[PDB]
Write a protein that binds this ligand. Structure first.
Ligand SMILES: [Mg+2]
Ligand SMILES: [Mg+2]
Ligand SMILES: [Mg+2]
Lengths: 136, 197, 189, 172, 106
RNA sequence: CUUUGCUCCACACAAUAUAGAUGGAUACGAAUAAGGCGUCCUUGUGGCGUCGCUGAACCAUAGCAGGCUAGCAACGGUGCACUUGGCGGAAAGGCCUUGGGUGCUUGCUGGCGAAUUGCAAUGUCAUUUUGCGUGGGGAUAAAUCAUUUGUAUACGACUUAG
RNA sequence: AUUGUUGAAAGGGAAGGGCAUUUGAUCAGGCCAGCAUCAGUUUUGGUGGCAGGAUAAAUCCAUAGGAAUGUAGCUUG
């Protein structure tokens, strides 16, 4: 009938690939790939976030699933125009990945009183959840 | 953090795992290693067999019972690697090695306990893909270990029991994750989401 | 130099159906089914359409990229075997002593038995690998014909037979006796 | 050496009474600081001209920054170096955003592939290859194809802790 | 609650030393959760106790204590140096110590 | 079968001394050029969706080291002892389950207590091992020497018999 | 020297010794700490103002010219 090979559905280093910088002074910010230098280096640019145009080792970055249309070697203003058109910031903020990053940041920020309030609320949510597991 | 750590030896590199275990014990952490028969060594099988034969050649000439002793079982090959990375002739070193146990397969009581891995020693994260490697059970059998088949029979049985356990927990995890989803869109759940929970 | 991308194409013909998952290839055609574990190579298979599979290496050295065309051939031969099949012909060669070949059973096993090789009283036995089919051609004198889906099984079984009849302690330029492969080919042509 | 800068260094023989305004010679020198740049300047001048630091003077040393430090360029680089046996010329090609980045790579390469230390190497010329047709090396050419994409298979995330409670995935 | 702990857990790893000479006047302590010297800076000056048990009751207890303080960081991995009023005994390499949260600067 | 010896259990009371408790060792297997989870159906090397980018988790967690009391709402959670049935021999000595009992409940709302350890001092809460005394059960031998044998033997040892 | 008895203690192919502390035993004549404000020496952070250079180079803006790993449009297939 039909053949059925799988895939392996990799994120590609390509012009327009959005990346989350992991190491350095821009760490945590997004940036687009603008040109490919070699197997390990790429030129990135993150005008919105304030990541300066720069050559960077792919080891310092994590490829995200987001890509947007961008000409090879686009200058910063062009990157900035196409980025906001493509709605890259909002697409990122909707991801489970971004939400986890945010959650981790939120929990880290909690006051000792807020931690106390959290315990009291979890005790409450637990009461009702465990009541529902008894029925079903 | 845990009062005993149970490392699943499978898929780890002998030396890199040995080096981490040795340091943990010297720092006063009890460790158990299981599935020592599934441990790897970089280098093709033949090379590693040749190295083991070089080791077998070594013996006290005037009386072979005076050592060195050539243990063949996977667990004891791992123990040899470890013993070499600890000052095992001192009282501190003897104490450190009392904090360690190594087993082929996963005997009781450790069969019903969580098993961790050591990423700095995982073969799949360490070796360049394409590089050849030995599995320690095969090596041990070739140099005279006798219980490869018994361990394999016992491990097949344990995995049947374990798959049944998992099937049940995976079912109970649905009921929970379902009941947690109905709890969302309550006032309490929305309040918790504000505070990062 | 690491090549960014090398790629081979595998042409799937009408009757045959290639399944691939974690590098375990199953081919299924008219003549039957073959499988092949390729977990010993880092390649990526991809379906273009129902008639074309691509196989690619990314960022590969000279030795890695050499493997890729091997992978193409091994999968192509699986497909040939399960449509056209494989058929190796072997002739017997002898000055004086007629080599005497026939199939036997040793506990429902199957064995190519070779008697009288250079007048030897030893009886030579060669297992018939599973999925290989032996037959003695009538039109041609002193010809055995091995055949099967798997070229690796067929070809090895012929080599098993060629090699059992090696001549010892004699000058093999003179003593040319043996059972040699005369023709590699397909069943349907 | 280190992370390289590029310097213009300009020197001359000291004025005599006979020759009150000697000819100025300029070099571009890659070096990690000015002190080394001046030393290299004399090292090379003395191979070319009858002059030496004692009988000469540096008139200027100026760092030369890259004109377009975030344009990707293909550089040709001509090199002379000493092997253990002899002395060889070599052309290599390097793709980078600056001459200074190209030279860092060149030096690292010659060390890796030919075991040539800094002392053993002379950079004869470094030049941006203006057109893609003129790139002569397959290892550069392959990065100049249209709509180049590629995956990074087999990702290894470095762990902070010694133990991990799940087998890791190498997916990307 | 179940927990009553107002200290961070640590382990006595070693005396300060070169390859072949130790200095018992300084101990090295690994504090749980501290992976860098930057993080270890928080614990500088905090009091440490090694608590241990004895057979003979003295001044109405069978528990004894050796007090010290964290003095500075050690290496790149969040180990700290510490000094005790009397030096820690070498038998305790691998033993647990308690890093208190006083004197406080929060 | 008499210094009431031996043993087990419960309970005190002593000593003992710790390679080092201080909320929880929180269980699939397999792959990694691939997987997990959910879902659907022609049940497949299936379709669809979703997750990862570390446990920075999850669970637990408020009360004289956690007191004494009054209600509300649920009929849930949890401890202890006791029962029901089952499964576990790799070192099983544990996992699960029935039923009722008895506490506790911070799911929610009240009342009373806490001081002077004096501005910190581990400020004592764990875990072994053994003895000793009470009460309750339970059990009622051997080995060695000496003698003896010669399948044994320098002597011990060995092998026999009484 | 060497020995007996008693008492105490340790003992996986010597024993003995140095530095340090734990434990036990023993013993003579203020003892042990905490915080604040300083001083001497030093270590590790946060943050402010200035100077230079191609009075950084860039980005950015304006403008002239260009091409290709040739965008739109167009023409064929
Ligand atoms: Mg043997
Ligand atoms: Mg001859
Ligand atoms: Mg001061």
């Amino acid at each position: 009938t039909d053949s059925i090979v799988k895939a392996s559905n990799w994120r590609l280093v390509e012009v327009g690939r959005v990346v989350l910088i992991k190491k350095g002074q821009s760490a945590g910010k997004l940036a687009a790939i603008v040109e490919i230098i070699d197997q390990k280096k790429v030129l990135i640019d993150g005008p919105k976030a304030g990541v300066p145009r720069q050559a960077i080792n792919l080891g310092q970055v994590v490829l995200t699933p987001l890509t947007f249309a961008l000409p090879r070697g686009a200058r910063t203003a062009t990157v900035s125009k196409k980025w906001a058109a493509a709605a890259v910031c909002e697409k990122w903020a909707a991801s489970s990945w971004a939400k986890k990053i945010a959650q981790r940041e939120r929990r880290a920020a909690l006051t000792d009183f807020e931690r106390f309030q959290v315990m009291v609320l979890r005790k409450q949510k637990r009461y009702t959840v465990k009541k529902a597991l008894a029925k079903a | 953090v845990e009062p005993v750590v149970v490392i699943d030896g499978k898929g780890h590199l002998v030396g890199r795992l040995a080096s981490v275990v040795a340091k943990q014990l010297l720092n006063g952490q009890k460790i158990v290693v299981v599935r020592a028969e599934e441990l790897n060594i970089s280098g093709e099988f033949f090379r590693n067999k040749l190295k083991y034969h070089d080791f077998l050649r070594k013996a006290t000439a005037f009386n072979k019972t005076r050592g060195p002793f050539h243990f063949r079982a996977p667990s004891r090959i791992f123990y040899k690697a470890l013993r070499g990375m600890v000052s095992h002739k001192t009282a501190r070193g003897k104490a450190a090695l009392e904090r360690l146990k190594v087993f082929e397969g996963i005997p009781p009581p450790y069969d019903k306990k969580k098993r961790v891995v050591v990423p700095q020693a995982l073969r799949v994260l360490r070796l360049k893909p394409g590089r050849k490697y030995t599995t320690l059970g095969k090596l041990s059998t070739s140099v005279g270990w006798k219980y490869e088949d018994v361990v394999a029979k016992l491990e097949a049985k344990r995995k049947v029991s374990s798959a049944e356990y998992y099937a049940k927990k995976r079912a109970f995890t649905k009921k929970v994750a379902s009941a947690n989803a109905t709890a969302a869109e309550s006032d309490v759940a929305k309040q918790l989401a504000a505070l990062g929970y | 130099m690491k090549y960014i991308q090398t790629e081979q194409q595998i042409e799937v013909p009408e009757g045959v159906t290639v399944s691939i998952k974690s590098r375990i290839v199953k081919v299924v055609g008219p003549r039957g089914t073959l499988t092949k574990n390729l977990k010993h190579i880092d390649v990526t298979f991809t379906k273009v359409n129902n008639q074309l599979i691509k196989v690619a290496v990314h960022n590969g050295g000279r030795k890695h990229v050499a493997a890729l065309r091997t992978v193409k051939s091994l999968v192509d031969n699986m497909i040939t075997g399960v449509t056209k099949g494989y058929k190796y012909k072997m002739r017997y060669v002898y000055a004086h002593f007629p080599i005497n070949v026939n199939i036997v059973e040793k506990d429902g096993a199957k064995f190519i038995e070779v008697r009288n090789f250079l007048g030897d009283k030893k009886i030579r036995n060669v297992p018939v690998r599973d999925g290989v089919t032996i037959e003695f051609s009538t039109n041609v004198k002193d010809e055995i014909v091995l055949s099967g889906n798997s070229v690796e099984d067929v070809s090895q079984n012929a080599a098993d037979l060629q090699q059992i009849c090696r001549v010892r302690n004699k000058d093999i330029r003179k003593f040319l006796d043996g059972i040699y492969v005369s023709h590699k080919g397909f069943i349907t042509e | 050496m280190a992370h390289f800068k590029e310097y213009q260094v300009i020197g001359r023989r000291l004025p005599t009474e006979s020759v009150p305004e000697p000819k100025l010679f300029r070099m571009r020198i890659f070096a990690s600081n000015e002190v080394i740049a001046k030393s290299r300047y004399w090292y090379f001048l003395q191979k070319l001209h009858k002059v030496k630091k004692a009988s000469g003077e540096i008139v200027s040393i100026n760092q030369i920054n890259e004109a377009h430090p975030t344009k990707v360029k293909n550089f040709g680089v001509w090199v002379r170096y000493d092997s253990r046996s002899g002395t060889h010329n070599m052309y290599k090609e390097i793709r980078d955003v600056s001459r200074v980045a190209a030279v860092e790579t060149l030096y690292q390469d010659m060390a890796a592939r030919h075991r040539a230390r800094f002392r053993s190497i002379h950079i004869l010329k470094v030049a941006e290859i203006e057109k893609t047709a003129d790139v002569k090396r397959q290892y550069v050419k392959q990065f100049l194809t249209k709509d180049l994409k590629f995956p990074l298979p087999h990702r290894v995330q470095k762990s902070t802790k010694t133990f991990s409670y799940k087998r890791p995935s190498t997916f990307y | 609650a179940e927990s009553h702990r107002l200290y961070v857990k640590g382990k006595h790893l070693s005396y300060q030393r070169s390859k072949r000479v130790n200095n018992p006047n300084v101990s090295l302590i690994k504090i749980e959760g501290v992976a860098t010297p930057q993080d270890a800076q928080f614990y500088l000056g905090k009091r440490i106790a090694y608590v241990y048990r004895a057979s003979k009751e003295v001044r109405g207890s069978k528990i004894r204590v050796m007090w010290g303080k964290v003095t500075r960081t050690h290496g790149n991995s969040g180990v700290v140096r510490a000094t005790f009023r009397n030096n820690l005994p070498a038998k305790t390499f691998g033993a647990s110590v308690r890093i208190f949260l006083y004197p406080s600067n929060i």
